[PDB]
């Protein structure tokens, strides 16, 4: 199992961010995706998205409320998500955790939200 | 791994349902719980709850909006959930899927009863 | 004691309707079942079926003549009945009354649908 | 609660039989009546009549089809019934089961149908 994420992305604030994850494995089925956020300059990460068995589940982290949508296809080995209307509180590191049975692999994105001016 | 669910529960409508799941295994850190609903008289199931790594994740099935809370403790081998203010649309079969390192599943037939 | 019926059922006309009742208690024996009919848009109810001690007893309500059969099992806590060849005169609310040593009641709103 | 039945009655065949039941209790609304038949020389009893909530319900026992009618009044503590056109197949023991919340008391009638000649 191999997981790719771009190292960094810059997103103009107020626009949609596309958090790309592509992975490599021998195989939908039992594979699961989880995304996590680590706010910049903080010590903690919040897991906010989980996908498995054709179902999207969301955490209750307020800054991501009504902003998160699935943009992947596990058959095409794509674990991506979109975040609407990104703002500065969304600066930080995003971490994708992919599990393909037969634990799991992770890749990090440093997301920079930029001033739209 | 072994998963238990009571075969049936009756919930007076307008009150809280307590969906009990107890499991048996040798270990809670890699353990995951999922809950599904099969509305009575349909053949679809909606997966609406997932728990792994100390985090509750919820699906967007409207009849469960703002009703679902975690009532378990994986260290105490308890994968239970609560559902607030149950109404007749919540009648059906609830399925708990627990994974330890594939899943084991147990079923509840939940009947919501007229509180009158 | 707890008594459950679905809130509603839709029965295509000319076909058999299956009136489900499931109950919860600590215990056949002295337990009894009665079913009643409230025709839509009237305020009368006719009690038309009674079950106690392995015996089905029927009332003399013409629209239910030769249509009613027991489909329960008090040991499996099932108090259901069947109604053959349901027509529009059978539209209304059905009420299951279950007694285990006063009783709880549950309601079905039964809609008979054009089979065309 | 106390329940009375006559010990025996003789009914000329082809005539109506009147199965008297009178009872004693402190109270009509929750009380129920049931009547049962034990055919002479058999070991089985068939329950064929039930009365509760102002409603008469009948069993499907063929010899009592279109023969059984309520002749009581629970307010007057009378749980009687009538049987039309009694024939020899109706010989036997009749049992009245009365229930009055606040479990029930029973009384037996040995009914002899007699040749009317």
Distances from the Cα of B46 to the Cα of A84, B34, B58, C79, angstroms: 25, 11, 11, 29
Q: Is the distance from CB of C14 to CB of C30 less than 8 angstroms?
A: no
Q: How many contacts does B have with C, using Cβ atoms within 8 A?
A: 24
Contacts with B54 (C-beta within 8 Å, 6 or more apart), sequence order: none
Furthest CA-CA distance within chain A: 47
What is the Cα–Cα distance from A49 to C52, expressed in whole angstroms? 55
Q: Where are the alpha helices (DSSP H) in chain B?
A: none
Q: How far apart are CA D91 and CA D82, in angstroms?
A: 14
**Given an 8 Å threshold on Cβ–Cβ distance, is D59 in contact with C57?**
yes
Three-state DSSP state, B40: coil
d(CA C55, CA A111): 74
Contact C7 B113 (CB under 8 A): no
Helices (H) and strands (E) in chain B, counts: 0, 11
Number of helices followed by number of strands (H, E) in chain C: 0, 11
Q: Which CATH number fits domain D1-117: 3.10.20.30, 3.20.20.210, 3.30.70.20, 2.60.40.10?
A: 2.60.40.10
Please give the DSSP secondary-structure letter assigned to residue A84.
S
Cβ neighbours around A89 below 10 Å, total: 12
Strand-pairing partners, residue C94, are C37, C108
Q: Which two tokens stand for residue C90?
A: 């059978």
The helix (H) or strand (E) run that includes residue B95 is strand B92-99
Residue where the block lists tokens 């989980």 = A50
Q: Is residue D58 within 8 Å of C58, Cβ to Cβ?
A: yes
Pick C57's closest partner by Cβ from D53, D58, D101: D58
Within 13 Å, how many C-alpha atoms sit on residue B55's CB side? 20
Which residues of chain D lie closer than 8 angstroms to C101, CB-CB?
103
How far apart, in whole angstroms, are the C-alpha atoms of residue B106 and residue B98? 9
Mutate to test the interface with B, among C6, C11, C103 (most CBs of B within 10 A): C6
β-strand pairing of C8-12 with C103-113? parallel
**Alpha-carbon span A65 to A67, nearest angstrom:** 5
CA A17, CA A40: separation in Å to the nearest integer?
A: 17
**The pair of three-digit structure tokens given for residue A98, joined into one six-digit string:** 């992919």
Domain-wise residue ranges, chain A: 1-117
SS3 of A33-67: EEEEEEECCCCCCEEEEEEECCEEEECCCHHHCCC
Ramachandran region of residue D96, left (φ > 0), alpha (ψ -120 to 50) or beta?
Answer: beta
Q: Which residues pair with A2 in a beta bridge?
A: A24
Q: Are residues C106 and B113, on separate chains, in Cβ contact within 8 Å?
A: yes
Which of left, alpha, beta for A24 (phi over 0: left; psi -120 to 50: alpha)? beta
SS3 state at D60 = coil
Q: What superfamily would CATH give domain C1-116? A: Immunoglobulins (2.60.40.10)
Bridge partners of residue D4, in order along the sequence: D22
Which chain C residue is nearest to residue B89, measuring alpha carbons?
C7
**The two structure tokens encoding residue D83:** 């049987």
Q: Are B116 and B13 in contact (CB under 8 A)?
A: no
What is the chain A residue with the closest CA to B29? A103
Q: Where are the alpha helices (DSSP H) in chain C?
A: none
Å resolution of this model?
A: 2.4
Experimental method: X-ray
Q: Do B47 and A30 touch (CB under 8 A)?
A: no
Q: Do A57 and B53 touch (CB under 8 A)?
A: no
CA gap D67, D79 in Å, rounded: 17
Residues of B with a Cβ under 8 Å from any C Cβ are 8, 10, 40-41, 88, 91, 111-114
Distance from CA of B114 to the nearest CA of A (A): 31
């Amino acid at each position: 199992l191999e997981v790719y994420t771009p190292k960094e992305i810059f997103v103009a604030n107020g626009t949609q961010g596309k958090l790309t994850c592509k992975f490599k494995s021998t195989s939908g089925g039992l594979t699961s995706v989880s995304w996590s956020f680590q706010p910049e300059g903080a010590d903690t990460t919040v897991s906010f998205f989980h996908y498995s068995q054709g179902q999207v589940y969301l955490g209750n982290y307020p800054p991501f409320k009504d902003r998160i949508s699935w943009a992947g296809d596990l058959d095409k080995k794509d674990a991506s998500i979109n975040i609407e209307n990104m703002q500065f509180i969304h600066n930080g590191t995003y971490i994708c955790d992919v599990k393909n049975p037969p634990v799991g692999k992770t890749s990090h994105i440093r997301l920079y939200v930029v001033e739209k001016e």
